[PDB]
Amino acid sequence: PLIVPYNLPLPGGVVPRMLITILGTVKPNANRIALDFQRGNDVAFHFNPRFNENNRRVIVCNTKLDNNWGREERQSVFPFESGKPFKIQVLVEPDHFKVAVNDAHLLQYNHRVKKLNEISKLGISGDIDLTSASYTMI
């Protein structure tokens, strides 16, 4: 398995029609997972399944600019399950990141950071066994 936290360079940043696929298994008793699409120190797109926020499961998405988190976007549809294998697909589209989990659309996140060609790292962190992280153009 891959080491977590994992750093996947995105050379030359992201572009529409780039598909990022993350395969892994959620740990038993997981608390959190995070994907961080980064532009230098900024986080253009943080995708954060929280397994126990006030005893609820929720996905929190946000952007970090100059070390400050912005307004959260929250999705209560929660497709992850502790102990189970998952696939996260992030398809870059012209106006948003489009996220599907286990082949089912989950959410879109509008681009707040507009210099797509500078979003040149994906960090993968949290309570998973990570099997693969890759990208391709579709």
Ligand SMILES: Cc1ccc(S[C@@H]2O[C@H](CO)[C@H](O)[C@H](n3cc(-c4ccccc4F)nn3)[C@H]2O)cc1
């Ligand atoms: C004013 C203020 C107070 C508290 C918060 S809480 C904060 O909220 C962010 C989303 O708005 C984001 O989730 C932050 N975060 C999580 C991880 C993280 C790292 C490793 C594995 C999984 C992880 F989730 N790293 N950073 C989380 O600390 C925010 C604002």
